[PDB]
Design an enzyme around this catalytic site. Sequence first.
Site, PDB file in Angstrom:
ATOM      1  N   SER A 294       0.857  -1.175   0.000  1.00 35.36           N
ATOM      2  CA  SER A 294       0.000   0.000   0.000  1.00 35.36           C
ATOM      3  C   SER A 294       0.894   1.226   0.000  1.00 35.36           C
ATOM      4  O   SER A 294       1.811   1.324   0.819  1.00 35.36           O
ATOM      5  CB  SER A 294      -0.928   0.018   1.212  1.00 35.36           C
ATOM      6  OG  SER A 294      -1.700   1.201   1.237  1.00 35.36           O
ATOM      7  N   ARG A 295       0.637   2.151  -0.916  1.00 36.93           N
ATOM      8  CA  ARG A 295       1.496   3.313  -1.087  1.00 36.93           C
ATOM      9  C   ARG A 295       1.096   4.484  -0.207  1.00 36.93           C
ATOM     10  O   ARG A 295       1.740   5.534  -0.273  1.00 36.93           O
ATOM     11  CB  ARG A 295       1.508   3.738  -2.552  1.00 36.93           C
ATOM     12  CG  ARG A 295       1.696   2.568  -3.480  1.00 36.93           C
ATOM     13  CD  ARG A 295       2.216   2.978  -4.832  1.00 36.93           C
ATOM     14  NE  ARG A 295       2.090   1.873  -5.770  1.00 36.93           N
ATOM     15  CZ  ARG A 295       2.862   1.703  -6.831  1.00 36.93           C
ATOM     16  NH1 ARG A 295       3.820   2.572  -7.098  1.00 36.93           N
ATOM     17  NH2 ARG A 295       2.671   0.663  -7.628  1.00 36.93           N
ATOM     18  N   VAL A 296       0.062   4.338   0.610  1.00 36.76           N
ATOM     19  CA  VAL A 296      -0.298   5.345   1.597  1.00 36.76           C
ATOM     20  C   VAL A 296       0.305   5.022   2.956  1.00 36.76           C
ATOM     21  O   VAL A 296       0.859   5.894   3.621  1.00 36.76           O
ATOM     22  CB  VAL A 296      -1.832   5.490   1.680  1.00 36.76           C
ATOM     23  CG1 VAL A 296      -2.197   6.561   2.679  1.00 36.76           C
ATOM     24  CG2 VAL A 296      -2.396   5.831   0.323  1.00 36.76           C
TER      25      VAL A 296
END
Lengths: 50, 57, 119, 221, 100, 42, 121, 121, 240, 50
Positions: E25-27
């Site tokens: 997940s890039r968040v």
Amino acid sequence: TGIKAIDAMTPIGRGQRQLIIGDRKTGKTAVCVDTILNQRQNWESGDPKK
Amino acid sequence: RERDAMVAKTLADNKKSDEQFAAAQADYDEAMTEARVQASSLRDNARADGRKVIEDA
Amino acid sequence: AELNVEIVAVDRNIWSGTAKFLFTRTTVGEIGILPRHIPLVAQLVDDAMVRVEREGEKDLRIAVDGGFLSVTEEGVSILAESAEFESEIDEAAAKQDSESDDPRIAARGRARLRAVGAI
Amino acid sequence: VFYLHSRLLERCAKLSDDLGGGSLTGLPIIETKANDISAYIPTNVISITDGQCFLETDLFNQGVRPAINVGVSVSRVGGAAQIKAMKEVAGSLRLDLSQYRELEAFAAFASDLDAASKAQLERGARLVELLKQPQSQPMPVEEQVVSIFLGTGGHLDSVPVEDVRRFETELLDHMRASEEEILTEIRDSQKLTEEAADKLTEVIKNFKKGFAATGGGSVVP
Amino acid sequence: GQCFLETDLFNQGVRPAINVGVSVSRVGGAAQIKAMKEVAGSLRLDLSQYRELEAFAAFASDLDAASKAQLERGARLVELLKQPQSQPMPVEEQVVSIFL
Amino acid sequence: TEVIKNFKKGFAATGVVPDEHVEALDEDKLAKEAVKVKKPAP
Amino acid sequence: ILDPSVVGDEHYRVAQEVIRILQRYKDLQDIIAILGIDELSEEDKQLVNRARRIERFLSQNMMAAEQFTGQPGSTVPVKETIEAFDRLCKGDFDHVPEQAFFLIGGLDDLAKKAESLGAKL
Amino acid sequence: ILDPSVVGDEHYRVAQEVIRILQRYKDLQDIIAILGIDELSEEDKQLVNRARRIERFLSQNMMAAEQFTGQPGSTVPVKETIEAFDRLCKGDFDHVPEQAFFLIGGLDDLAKKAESLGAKL
Amino acid sequence: ATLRELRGRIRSAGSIKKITKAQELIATSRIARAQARLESARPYAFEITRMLTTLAAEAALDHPLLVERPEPKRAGVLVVSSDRGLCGAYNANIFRRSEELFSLLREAGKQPVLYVVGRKAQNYYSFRNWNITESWMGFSEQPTYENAAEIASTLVDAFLLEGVDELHIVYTEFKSMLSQSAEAHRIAPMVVEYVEEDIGPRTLYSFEPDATMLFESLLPRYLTTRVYAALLESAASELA
Amino acid sequence: LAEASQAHTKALEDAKSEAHRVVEEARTDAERIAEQLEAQADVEAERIKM
Ligand SMILES: Nc1ncnc2c1ncn2[C@@H]1O[C@H](COP(=O)(O)OP(=O)(O)OP(=O)(O)O)[C@@H](O)[C@H]1O
Ligand SMILES: [Mg+2]
């Protein structure tokens, strides 16, 4: 060529087509630049046959 | 007493004989390996300060 | 005359040849075999030594461990866990081995001493 | 495109004597992808040329530089493109390395190998360390003859494999300073006659008794 | 990001079949409450390293004590993350279980 | 932490050689080490 | 510029040794996967241990990754990196476990995480 | 056309026997090259010596070598070839030295070579 | 995509093939050496057997190692297997033979006690919750006489006594270079086998101090020699 | 004993003076090397000059 591996195992003559083939960052440009630099002493000799 | 001392020293100086024989090679090799690391300690300092002056020139 | 002698270790033939006389030490007492002799079975002492005597050579002294001995019509046979000739022994190693507290290696060292002519 | 490259690479020729005797040597470079020499343009240029030098990244990372795979590299001209000295001291080299490459699986069991097999293993390790070479430092053919003489005459069996390069380096240095006559007559006569080999062997032995390995040990037989 | 599901991991019993080595997940922690961000901080890297170690140690006879401790912890984490279908958990229970 | 610790004591975790159903060896396939004595005495 | 004349010879030698060790490890990985690590040499087992510790020590906690791990990042000077990896390739850390090399900075953080795992350095 | 319906049954038998012997020698060649020659059995050695003789007799004094050696090339009729290799596999030449088999024609050339090298039968 | 994976798998299989061919040739060499060791250890065994037989023909055959105790309750099984694992069905055959032996023992009311030699047997029996009394590892490649002495001593001291009533051994008999048979031998108590007469005007032996002392100090040595021969044969069989 | 001790110190001074030989050869080669390389140094300097 001034390179022991080439000059001993895969010799190059005058008039021959020797392919230098490799993936990338393997040292092909270096092989050819050293083959060029090795003719310095033959150029210093002033002999048009050498 | 002198006879047992006699052949006792005899085997003792056979002991000493081959121990001196071994010491021969011992400090022969010692001297010449000192000489090797001397001869290569020299002539490597020479190459090093050679590059010293190559680069500052 | 001569008697055939063969000393076999548990994993190797230690020696084999002919001899003029053969001295050793059974648990019951010392003993000397000569070319003809009664059939016999005996157990060498724990720190035994075996002196073979040959006609044209110098006598060969051997240290033997846990040996057994049997004399028959063919010759002498000595069975050993391990054996070590005289010209193979460090008398100082055998000396410090002799003063151990472990009886087994103490007997090993005493035999190695007996072979070299000490003790 | 095959014509595009073959029309170009057939102009590299060795002219006859009634055309002057000039020559044009070609060194075409081809960049493969993931060592796929079975691609289109690699296939064409391999078909065209007189020999190939296959450089590989796996050899380059293992320290073999120039990373020339001597097992698959080839030259269809061969010994006709060599001087006598190099044709002699390096005719031994190909199957030495073949034996070493087919023995290096037993590198961890040299105790279980025959005498000749362990000999071939050690000689091959030495010869592989011999063909290594720095960048932009080409050597004249006489120094290459002397180095491959070191390799194939057996004068490296006493030197640790992690000391061959330096050894060879220093030896050539010594020979360039002290015994220049060997290199000179190799250069002039193109052949290493037996007397030059005698003098070279003695020079090697003297340098050996003068040379000090990195573990501190000796290099004298 | 992506949640890469596999049929091999599915058949092995790992459900959801999320492949943690490639899932991402890039968040990141900004998409989490602080409790879960502190509790499940380096869980994905720990599980990727555990899968690598268990693939390396697949045939090794004896290993370090730390390698064994890591293998046991990584296993227990794998069986902790499995979950039935149609069975959600509130974020507090997830926090508590990852704390376990 | 303390709730987990006081819970683990009362937890009943669910943690003998199998049968293998292997037939008996033939009593004459089991070799016997014998002292081969040379006095006939039944 | 990974050249003996640009970065110096120590930098270059350490980099080449790291690369050689990692290439040999990559060559062995399939044999290790099938036949197990016990079928290798002792030479090769030593190399595999060193190579795993090197592969882990190349990783680092970056400043721009504090959102994915919660752990702040670190900076390692180039001389400290060269010295550290020289010691790694020589074998000075063959006793420290595989972890404690994972996502850390220089040598002092290696010491701290090793003692957090029960080891010296 | 190495098929009994074309070349004959005896030709096929001799060719298959030669191929079997050479293939078994190829099997043994690696254990020979790594462990040594009499690590093998003595049946294995009998086969290896026979196979060396057979493998060397397949060479020939070719017509292309006359320009370099002066001696004319050979033309061995197929019947004589079958006879020669049958006798070679039977073992009728296991004593003649190996060098007697390099670059020769039929059986008579082999005999002449053996005589100029001090052996027969 | 799968072209990269297929080429990588080809490289992997090539590496595995190189390694396995190397291991095969190494095993050929090592079994030559192991056969040598076995054949050279044979003569001492032959001669101690002869001395023991000529001692027993004139002694009292009431040694503890020679009487079958009434109502045997437990039997000691020594399972000889390997440490390295690239063997074939070697340890497998050993374990199936020992399982047949265990069922034989349990069909006669004897609970087997288990001693093992090697790592593979310990894996096989620790997986099955067995209780191995004593284990031995690290010498199945080159067994020496001191290992056999230790094993046999512990065995006979557990037999003479928590205490067993007979000693069996399960090892691989080596023969033919192509025969490797897992066999179960009963090393204790020995059965006595009156062979022959072979005693006419023959001369009687003389024993010092007597017959029975030599017999009772030579029997444990005989059992140790047999255990040593078993270890050597199992090593040669493992290499085959 | 007399034999061994005389041989001992004989080999001793043999070693010593032959070591002097090798090390003095070394120092002459050292001055030689310094010469040649500094020549190279400033003949490269003038190369960059032009
Ligand atoms: N003989 C050598 N020894 C050490 N390093 C070398 C050698 N030859 C080349 N290198 C190094 O390898 C790197 C790549 O070399 P080079 O540029 O010659 O390869 P290339 O085939 O031109 O790759 P590309 O064309 O993809 O750039 C260079 O940085 C060089 O420093
Ligand atoms: Mg380029």
